[PDB]
Amino acid sequence: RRALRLGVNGLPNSLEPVNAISNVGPRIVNQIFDTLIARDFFAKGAPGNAIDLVPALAESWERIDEKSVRFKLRQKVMFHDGVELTADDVAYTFSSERLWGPEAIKKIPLGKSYSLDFDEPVVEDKYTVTLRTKTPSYLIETFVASWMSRIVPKEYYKKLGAVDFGNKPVGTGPYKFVEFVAGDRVVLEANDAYWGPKPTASKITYQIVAEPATRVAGLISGEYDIITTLTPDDIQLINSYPDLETRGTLIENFHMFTFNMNQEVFKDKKLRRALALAVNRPIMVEALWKKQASIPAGFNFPNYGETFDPKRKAMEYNVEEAKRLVKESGYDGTPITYHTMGNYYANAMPALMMMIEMWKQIGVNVVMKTYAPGSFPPDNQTWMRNWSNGQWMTDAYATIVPEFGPNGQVQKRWGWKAPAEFNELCQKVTVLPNGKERFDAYNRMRDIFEEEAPAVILYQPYDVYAARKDVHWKPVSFEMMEFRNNLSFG
Ligand SMILES: O[C@@H]1[C@@H](O)[C@@H](O)CO[C@H]1O
């Protein structure tokens, strides 16, 4: 088998699966680990965007009541160190100690904020485990299929601790850990003992190539098999080569800019709103995305299924109202910084250059500040910054509630003083089943989010990959790379 060489935009700081959550971690951790329920993106010949849930580490499951789901595990599944997967490992993955409890907070900083209102899992027998919540939750199934739910081995993880585990991970996945050179490369090798479809690559190397031009030059020279995070502008050059091609898809993620609301200038919504009202999204989509990025009608996406509103009004664009707001805020012309980690996000710097011009036209002076990979500056050094959110559930709960909710980092770390009504709705949507009330509640939260502008949604990006024609691999509609029944060499 051939060794797969990937040229990537970045690498996670840890391979601990929850701590690896980002645009760059899942493409690695999806290989090392498995979940209880997996998504089949290619079901019924779909082009990598199917919503179908299939058994994975759990052979079967059934909801018991409004607060609990019982899982029957696949038997004789082995972790990379030869240890058999049991209900103890699953119970540990979803425990108070490891994930969501007070003791987990130092190990996994966003563990509590990103998890459901869990109670301790109940081990029924060697291959049976019940996962439960303290309050009603109709989200257990989607959460279990998510990137929060990769199964870790109890004994090994406990012996290493979360930090050491992140540097030497052990999972049940099709590929096992070889090496991790901080901010340089991650090397994995085939786990030939895998319970599912056998790995088709002998080795997988994720090599950081921060500059997108250097990444393209690497692919042309034959240094890489697949490269990530390109823009639709790179398409024509790569496809002119008979041995190379581009492979792209709209992903279930949105690019945005956000604010440090602990800063005096952003404590009040006025200037946040003015900056939001001046963003001409259709012009950015034409100029940078060749019409391929999608502009959502609010914090609202098709993957939400029952909580997606196809009838919602477009996010407002109003230059005159933006000008009136800049004057009202008493803004004095002082430059406001906007932090970006180069082009970690496709089109980050070109989008910022366009926005700086749009903002200069409303009387706001914004200046770009770059930071190095894995070198995010202290919070007090930041005003504006770009970010993204992967829409990780088949429900509107993520990411409005885990990121922007009363327990989330936007309010707790970044100082958004959310209206009491918003926080009250977050709590209501957490516990309600789908229906008219829950659907209407998300639309009200969406309206408040637009009035408050704690972040400004830009678009759903069109993820662009480039690969050697002889490397058969299809992108999926999520910020990850799937190789199960989706990797072969010509
Ligand atoms: O990197 C972000 C992460 O910080 C979290 O918001 C989830 O979505 C990802 O895209």
Residue numbers in the entry: 32 to 521
Reported in the publication:
The mature AccA structure is a monomer of 493 residues composed of two lobes, each formed by a central β-sheet flanked by α-helices. We identified the pyranose-2-phosphate-like moiety shared by these two ligands as the key recognition template for AccA.
A better resolution structure of this complex at 1.9 Å resolution in a different space group using the native protein was determined. The major difference concerns the region comprising the residues 403–408, which can move up to 1.7 Å to accommodate the ligand in the binding site. While Agrocinopine A is fully defined in the electron density maps, the leucine-like moiety of agrocin 84 is mobile. A particularity of AccA which is not shared by these related PBPs is the presence of the flexible loop 402–414 located between the β-strands β15 and β16 which can accommodate agrocinopine A. This loop corresponds to a conserved rigid helix in all similar PBPs and models superposition shows that an equivalent helix in our structure would clash with the last glucose of agrocinopine A.
